[PDB]
Amino acid sequence: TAKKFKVVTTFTIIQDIAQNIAGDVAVVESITKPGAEIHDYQPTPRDIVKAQSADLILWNGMNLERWFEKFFESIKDVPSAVVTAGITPLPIREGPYSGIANPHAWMSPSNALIYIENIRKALVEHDPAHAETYNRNAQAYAEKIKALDAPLRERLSRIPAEQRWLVTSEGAFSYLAKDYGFKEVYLWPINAEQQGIPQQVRHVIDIIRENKIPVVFSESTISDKPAKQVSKETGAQYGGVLYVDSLSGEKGPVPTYISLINMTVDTIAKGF
């Protein structure tokens, strides 16, 4: 056979996690495309029809998708589920969104296990005919995620503790940084139309000076120009691109959530 159970997700990371749980018994599609900015995405009429055709809608919550609640108002009779349920938020530390949840919880692979469980539960509840495929796929995929911890830590193990400074454009790596003992510095705390970046750019250059930070990075859905300037004004090498808010295309270097975590840690590690 019939027309398969259809899941629509707001962005690509959730799409890939959900598709691993769904296997071939459900079809999972993302509203946003690879490479597109997800926080302030502007949905189109095509997007309403796509979401309205789903049997279940998955979104991040933690107000990642500033567009979603207004968007969902146009969708009728389709259940939605927040895939971060039960995750404890790290607060945004500075700027006009200080004190709001940092939404990038998927960058901690231990948090990913909670994403998987929330998605499994939603799939089993709303598609009970395939409960055993979902439960089997979710346990197998959770073991793939747990198996990342040892190679990831080993990959970062050369960098001594007080050299572990991670300097990015968006402050999108706070969950990854807490997991692996890095201190975070960023050019802006969360993607948004905002003031303060040129004054934050001076501050970052300042903090690179004091601590002799060797590398700075950018991310794949935003501009590399601020990070490349900070590298020019310091001696630090420009290390990016890092992946957090989007996968690549299916043929690019980051087609899956696992490849996103691995390539991001790999790129950090080679910068030092």
Q: Which residues bind Mn ion (CB under 5 A)?
A: 79, 125, 170, 172, 191, 245
- Tell the smallest beta-carbon distance from residue 59 to Mn ion (Å): 13
Residue 188: phi and psi, rounded to 5, are -155, 145
- Tell the smallest beta-carbon distance from residue 122 to Mn ion (Å): 6
User: Could you report how far apart the first and last alpha carbons of the chain are, in Å?
Assistant: 52
Which CB sits closer to Mn ion, 172 or 265?
Answer: 172
Which CB sits closer to Mn ion, 108 or 234?
Answer: 108
- Tell the smallest beta-carbon distance from residue 144 to Mn ion (Å): 24
Which CB sits closer to Mn ion, 127 or 234?
Answer: 127
- Tell the smallest beta-carbon distance from residue 170 to Mn ion (Å): 5
Annotated binding site for Fe(2+): 39, 104, 170, 245
Q: Which residues pair with 183 in a beta bridge?
A: 165
Tokens for 125, please give them. Answer: 């509840």
Query: Cα separation of 233 and 91, whole Å?
Result: 30
Which CB sits closer to Mn ion, 191 or 231?
Answer: 191
Which CB sits closer to Mn ion, 159 or 172?
Answer: 172
- The sign of the CA dihedral 249, 252, 255, 257 is negative
Q: Is 256 left (phi over 0), alpha (psi -120 to 50) or beta?
A: beta
* Orientation of helix 12-22 relative to helix 257-271, angle to 10°: 130
The answer to whether the bond into 230 is cis (omega within 30° of 0) is: no
Are 267 and 245 a contacting pair, CB within 8 Å? no
Instruction: Of 96, 102, 16, 107, give the one whose Cα is nearest residue 61.
Output: 102
Annotated binding site: 39, 104, 170, 245
The one-character DSSP state at 101 is B
Query: Cα separation of 160 and 157, whole Å?
Result: 7
Residue 117: phi and psi, rounded to 5, are -65, -40
- Tell the smallest beta-carbon distance from residue 143 to Mn ion (Å): 25
- Tell the smallest beta-carbon distance from residue 79 to Mn ion (Å): 5
Which CB sits closer to Mn ion, 79 or 249?
Answer: 79
